[PDB]
């Protein structure tokens, strides 16, 4: 569960806003993710998890949030960097 797929999807995400240019499709297989979370760290994982990254998605999902008011990729690019740090730390 939330470790697993939040690697997963990150890669996914990417591959379609990097390699694809498709904004639309990132915030697709990005917000779910975003959305599990809303609920709340409950198991001894989720809880360490949510400690390392949470404040760190929230941020990321909130300059995506920015994006759709100013359609300007900084704020992606802003998005970006704290995701891809996440993701560094979830393989290591």
Known sequence: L???MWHEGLEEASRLYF???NVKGM???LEP???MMERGPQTL???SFNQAYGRDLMEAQEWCRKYMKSG???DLTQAWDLYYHVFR???K
């Open 89 to 91: 730390r979830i393989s």
């Open 33 to 35: 993710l975003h959305a």
């Open 27 to 29: 915030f697709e297989v």
């Open 45 to 47: 994982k989720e809880t």
């Open 19 to 21: 390699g694809e240019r």
């Open 72 to 74: 300007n990729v900084k």
């Open 2 to 4: 939330w470790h697993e």
